[PDB]
Design a protein around this ligand. Structure first.
Ligand code: CLA
Ligand code: CLA
Ligand code: CLA
Ligand code: CLA
Ligand SMILES: CC(=O)O[C@H]1CC(C)(C)C(=C=C/C(C)=C/C=C/C(C)=C/C=C/C=C(C)/C=C/C=C(\C)C(=O)C[C@@]23O[C@]2(C)C[C@@H](O)CC3(C)C)[C@](C)(O)C1
Ligand SMILES: CC(=O)O[C@H]1CC(C)(C)C(=C=C/C(C)=C/C=C/C(C)=C/C=C/C=C(C)/C=C/C=C(\C)C(=O)C[C@@]23O[C@]2(C)C[C@@H](O)CC3(C)C)[C@](C)(O)C1
Ligand SMILES: CC(=O)O[C@H]1CC(C)(C)C(=C=C/C(C)=C/C=C/C(C)=C/C=C/C=C(C)/C=C/C=C(\C)C(=O)C[C@@]23O[C@]2(C)C[C@@H](O)CC3(C)C)[C@](C)(O)C1
Ligand SMILES: CC(=O)O[C@H]1CC(C)(C)C(=C=C/C(C)=C/C=C/C(C)=C/C=C/C=C(C)/C=C/C=C(\C)C(=O)C[C@@]23O[C@]2(C)C[C@@H](O)CC3(C)C)[C@](C)(O)C1
Ligand SMILES: CC(=O)O[C@H]1CC(C)(C)C(=C=C/C(C)=C/C=C/C(C)=C/C=C/C=C(C)/C=C/C=C(\C)C(=O)C[C@@]23O[C@]2(C)C[C@@H](O)CC3(C)C)[C@](C)(O)C1
Ligand code: KC2
Ligand code: KC2
Ligand code: KC2
Lengths: 222, 213, 211
């Protein structure tokens, strides 16, 4: 998308705030590629981070209140009452490494030229749709559902509703990237979020440290 | 240029070059190169002295409450604070100022912005913006927030005159501070704060002693 | 407003004083804008300072009298006999942050040129009415009661009455800053303001401007 398209998108997301890039990432040519592709990468980054942060907000609320799956042994193995950041550290590293590799397979599926062009879209940097996820039609083996709408809902949605939904996606993502980080910052830095004092359990570890044992130095195996 | 500029700075005195330093042909580069180098040296010294005056006054009373600065007292000489600073911090500060200096010296950059080297028709002290730098550079050295980038032309020279005079005053001021610091009673009416005993022109005296000395 | 208009406005504020500008701040270009912009910024600053000072005078009296609502728990639980500054400092930190953040949102709304232009006004520096707080029509959800005149008592007022009111606003705020700062000075350094010495301005032992 062009910077004019970004201005229009910003003025539709929030008419009053409008286009509010004060650091000019929209202008810096990333890897030497054109502005129309840096805009695509930046917009895909915004959508993706907002997605992961919205999911992370809901997941943090779920983990802090120990609403766990009833019929699994890993959840039972993890002690109860831990902070939500620690509910991640108390897991077998082999499960962390499979969550991460699941996201890896999915983000390899997404960026694939062949799947995207078979379904009709292109890469987000090649003028495609930022925040699209191709279905598993060209998958080696069959699979029951896709990722976006595994069921049928929004197979018959108007383009107006889709545009409204993408605007709401971007806005809610911008807000959730701040809410989830409010949770993390209040956990690891007490009195950092003034309104959550005494609400978020405290935490000592590093939320940017996925595995307990350092993979770069000494991993663990199963 | 120096006569007219000196009369602008102080028309009563006009010109006083008692040692004829402008007349002396520095490195055989010509009197024009002498004038350019001397004006740029005066401006560089004035800027660093102005900043050093403010920094000395600040550091004598306030420190940053995070490490490693929180561990330093403020009731000692600021030169003593610098002496205590870790060797890596000293080298890194000097290397950063070296970057600013070599960027100012880079001809291609200030030529991009429309200036020449200070001793060949370059207006003294035109520092360049970090646009030729490779990766993102959110702000610049001069007009970092771009506040007064659209200043007034006559103001843009009145400010130069005020800068030169304030720089001269700060040269004498910071040096008076150092004089009273390393020699008590050196500056009468200043002997009230800090009496460290060591050479301030020894960046790494605390760290190492160069061989041969 | 041009500087000729500023001299005129000063004359309307007080025919005797005239344009008393010993620092000549009106004749300036802050951040490299125009002189009209500098005048607009100074006018908005004066109006806003007078407004906050007028509300602060009333608040200081109301707090010094220990006048508190009959429905709130926080204030009723807070200690009595305190100075207003002590009362603010012992208010809950969350409450202080909500107050300051709502004030932040109001400042953002006032500065927002999209909203002013939708209402037929402009930002004060760029040429417009200094001190005009826009309505809340552009809000995501339709609140009632716009900030200025929520119940609508000045809707049918005349332009001449409104101009007189703005002049009164500026002058009354000018002495309101002096009054509130007199209270703060007397709570701080005693004998700063002689006249209040009898009423016993409740002493305060902290720097108010350091939350
Ligand atoms: C944003 C990413 C995120 C991350 C990194 C984690 C991480 C974790 N979750 Mg999960 N979780 C998330 C979001 C996330 N969660 C959300 C949004 C929910 C609400 C549905 C949950 C609900 C949840 C439960 C109920 C439990 C965990 C548990 C766990 C642990 C093991 C993995 C697992 O059980 O998969 C979680 C299951 C999923 C289906 C994946 C979650 C992410 C997607 C986006 C969900 C989309 C909804 C889908 C229709 C269902 C680990 C701490 C377990 C635990 O505490 O073990 C110690 C556990 O019992 N999570
Ligand atoms: C192996 C799995 C995997 C793979 C293949 C990718 C692939 C991608 N991610 Mg990432 N991502 C992953 C896991 C993975 N992710 C997980 C688990 C999460 C959390 C849910 C995310 C969250 C995430 C976000 C929030 C974003 C990406 C983005 C990206 C893109 C560029 C990242 C990049 O290479 O820059 C960095 C390259 C590195 C090598 C980073 C250093 C990693 C350490 C030092 C080594 C780790 C080795 C590994 C674990 C084995 C690409 C589509 C970006 C994107 O799509 O932008 C448009 C983006 O914004 N990812
Ligand atoms: C003129 C050059 C100069 C030099 C050589 C030093 C040297 C030193 N200063 Mg600094 N300092 C300066 C100017 C300078 N200062 C100025 C102008 C100020 C006032 C803003 C300060 C305020 C100051 C404080 C409060 C402290 C130091 C400290 C230090 C030490 C570590 C480096 C540091 O923190 O950088 C200082 C940080 C900078 C960003 C560079 C300063 C110079 C630029 C020109 C300022 C830009 C202004 C901008 C509006 C902000 C070291 C002795 C610390 C110390 O003594 O710890 C042992 C310490 O606590 N300095
Ligand atoms: C490694 C770092 C480095 C480098 C490459 C330079 C390079 C330069 N400095 Mg120096 N300078 C440095 C550190 C450095 N400086 C630091 C840390 C400061 C701040 C305290 C200064 C403050 C400074 C001033 C005030 C002046 C110079 C000047 C000079 C020039 C000649 C110096 C010379 O030959 O002296 C060795 C012989 C040259 C552009 C002079 C100049 O450019 O005059 C025209 C000048 O006026 N420098
Ligand atoms: C204090 C305490 O206890 O807790 C605190 C601290 C703690 C734990 C840290 C917390 C946290 C989380 C935080 C702060 C997380 C921060 C995460 C962050 C900041 C993650 C950057 C990723 C960057 C990447 C992947 C770069 C790719 C780089 C690549 C691939 C490039 O090519 C770069 C590029 O430039 C080139 C080379 C060329 C250019 O042409 C183009 C661009 C520009 C693209 C909390 C929640 O605040 C709590
Ligand atoms: C709390 C508690 O205790 O509750 C009690 C309640 C109660 C009621 C007493 C109990 C019970 C009974 C229950 C709940 C029974 C559940 C039975 C159930 C759910 C039975 C599924 C069969 C699926 C099959 C055979 C799959 C074939 C799979 C085939 C043919 C495939 O290849 C699938 C696939 O082709 C797709 C579809 C699409 C392709 O893209 C991918 C592939 C090729 C892989 C329990 C267990 O006691 C628990
Ligand atoms: C301290 C202070 O002073 O302040 C603050 C600081 C701080 C930390 C910020 C605070 C906070 C909390 C905040 C702001 C939290 C924000 C959290 C956020 C923003 C969380 C979004 C989740 C969205 C999801 C999961 C959406 C899924 C949506 C999905 C999967 C859809 O189905 C989309 C959909 O389009 C389809 C595909 C089909 C259509 O038919 C329509 C629908 C919609 C169904 C505090 C505590 O309040 C106080
Ligand atoms: C003892 C006795 O008998 O005698 C003496 C002995 C002795 C030792 C000499 C003494 C001394 C010391 C003295 C007097 C030292 C004086 C030091 C001095 C004179 C220090 C200037 C600093 C200026 C700065 C940092 C400027 C920043 C300027 C900045 C950051 C700007 O914004 C630049 C600006 O251009 C822009 C971009 C926009 C324009 O709109 C204008 C402005 C300006 C805003 C004594 C003890 O006092 C008395
Ligand atoms: C002749 C002469 O002498 O000078 C000449 C030269 C000179 C100086 C250049 C000139 C000028 C300008 C002048 C004199 C300008 C003065 C400006 C001034 C004096 C401006 C105050 C603002 C106050 C505010 C915003 C207060 C907020 C106050 C707030 C929000 C509060 O504290 C609230 C609160 O307190 C309550 C209500 C209750 C307590 O429970 C809690 C606290 C404490 C939190 C003149 C005009 O040319 C005259
Ligand atoms: C956990 C992650 C996650 C969250 C929390 C989340 C939240 C929201 C919200 C928030 C309130 C809204 C309102 C919203 C709306 C839409 N989402 Mg979205 N979404 C997530 C994930 C995905 C994925 C993977 C895809 C996707 C999409 C769409 C489309 C389709 C537009 C179109 O087809 O034109 C619309 C309208 C698909 C797409 O193509 O987006 C461009 C797609 O592939 N979303 N989404
Ligand atoms: C320690 C840092 C430092 C200090 C303390 C300081 C103080 C003062 C004061 C005194 C109160 C005044 C009044 C003043 C005024 C001007 N400064 Mg100056 N200045 C510093 C640093 C630099 C740098 C790096 C540059 C610079 C410049 C200009 C120009 C532009 C003129 C033009 O471009 O026409 C004007 C008018 C630029 C230049 O080229 O000046 C030769 C430039 O790049 N300054 N400066
Ligand atoms: C706590 C804050 C506060 C105080 C203590 C205060 C006191 C006084 C006094 C003192 C005795 C007078 C006499 C006075 C008069 C007027 N005030 Mg005022 N005022 C405050 C706040 C606001 C706000 C937010 C606005 C406003 C306005 C007007 C207008 C409308 C003129 C017009 O509609 O043309 C007139 C005549 C509105 C405006 O347009 O101001 C530019 C507007 O938005 N005031 N105001």
């Amino acid at each position: 998308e062009t910077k004019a398209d970004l201005e229009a998108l910003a003025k539709d997301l929030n008419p009053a705030v409008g286009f509010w890039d004060p650091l000019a990432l929209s202008d810096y040519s990333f890897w030497g590629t054109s502005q129309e592709a840096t805009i695509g990468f930046l917009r895909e980054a915004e959508i993706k981070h907002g997605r992961i942060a919205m999911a992370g907000f809901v997941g943090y609320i779920v983990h802090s209140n120990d609403i766990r799956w009833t019929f699994d042994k890993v959840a039972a193995s993890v002690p109860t009452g831990l902070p939500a950041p620690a509910v991640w550290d108390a897991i077998p590293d082999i499960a962390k490494w499979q969550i991460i590799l699941f996201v890896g397979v999915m983000e390899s599926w997404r960026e694939n030229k062949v799947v995207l062009e078979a379904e009709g879209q292109k890469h987000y940097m090649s003028g495609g749709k930022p925040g699209y996820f191709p279905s598993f039609d060209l998958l080696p083996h069959p699979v029951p559902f896709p990722l976006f709408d595994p069921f049928g809902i929004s197979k018959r949605a108007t383009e107006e509703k889709k545009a409204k939904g993408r605007l709401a996606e971007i806005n809610n993502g911008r807000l959730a990237m701040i809410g989830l980080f409010g949770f993390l910052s209040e956990a690891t830095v007490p009195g950092s979020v003034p309104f959550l004092k005494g609400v978020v359990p405290a935490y000592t570890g590093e939320v940017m440290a996925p595995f307990t044992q350092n993979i770069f130095t000494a991993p663990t195996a199963l | 240029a120096l006569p007219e500029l000196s009369k602008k700075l102080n028309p009563v005195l006009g010109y006083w070059d008692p040692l004829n330093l402008a007349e002396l042909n520095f490195w055989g580069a010509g009197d024009d190169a002498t004038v350019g180098f001397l004006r740029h040296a005066e401006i560089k010294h004035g800027r660093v002295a102005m900043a050093a005056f403010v920094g000395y006054c600040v550091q004598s009373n306030v420190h940053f409450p995070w490490a490693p600065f929180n561990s330093i007292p403020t009731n000692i000489a600021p030169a003593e604070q610098w002496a205590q600073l870790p060797e890596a911090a000293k080298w890194q500060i000097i290397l950063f100022v070296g970057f600013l200096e070599v960027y100012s010296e880079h001809s291609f950059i200030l030529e991009k912005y429309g200036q020449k080297h200070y001793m060949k028709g370059g207006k003294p002290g035109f520092f360049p913006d970090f646009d030729t730098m490779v990766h993102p550079v959110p702000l610049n050295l001069w007009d970092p927030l771009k506040a007064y980038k659209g200043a007034s032309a006559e103001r843009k020279a009145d400010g130069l005159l005020k800068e030169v005079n304030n720089g001269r005053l700060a040269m004498i001021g910071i040096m008076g501070f150092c004089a009273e610091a390393r020699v008590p009673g050196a500056v009468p009416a200043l002997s009230n704060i800090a009496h460290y005993a060591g050479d301030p022109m020894a960046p790494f005296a605390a760290n190492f002693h160069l061989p041969g000395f | 407003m041009d500087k000729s208009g500023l001299e005129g406005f000063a004359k309307e504020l007080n025919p005797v004083v005239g344009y008393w500008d010993p620092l000549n701040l009106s004749n300036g270009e802050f951040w490299g804008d125009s002189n009209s912009a500098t005048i607009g910024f100074l006018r908005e600053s004066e109006i806003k300072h007078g407004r906050v000072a007028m509300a602060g005078f009333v608040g200081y009296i109301v707090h010094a009298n220990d006048i508190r609502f009959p429905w709130d728990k926080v204030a009723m639980a807070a200690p009595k006999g305190l100075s207003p500054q002590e009362l603010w400092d012992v208010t809950p930190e969350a409450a202080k942050w909500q107050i300051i953040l709502t004030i932040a949102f109001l400042e953002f709304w006032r500065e927002n040129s999209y909203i002013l232009s939708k209402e037929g006004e402009q930002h004060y520096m760029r040429g417009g009415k200094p001190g005009y707080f826009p309505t809340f029509s552009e809000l995501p959800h339709p609140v009632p009661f716009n900030l200025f005149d929520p119940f609508g008592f000045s809707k049918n007022a005349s332009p001449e009455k409104k101009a007189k009111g703005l002049l009164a606003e500026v002058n009354n705020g000018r002495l309101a800053m002096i009054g509130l700062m007199g209270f703060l000075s007397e709570a701080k350094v005693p004998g700063s303001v002689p006249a209040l010495a009898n009423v016993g301005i409740r002493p305060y032992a902290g720097e108010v401007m350091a939350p």
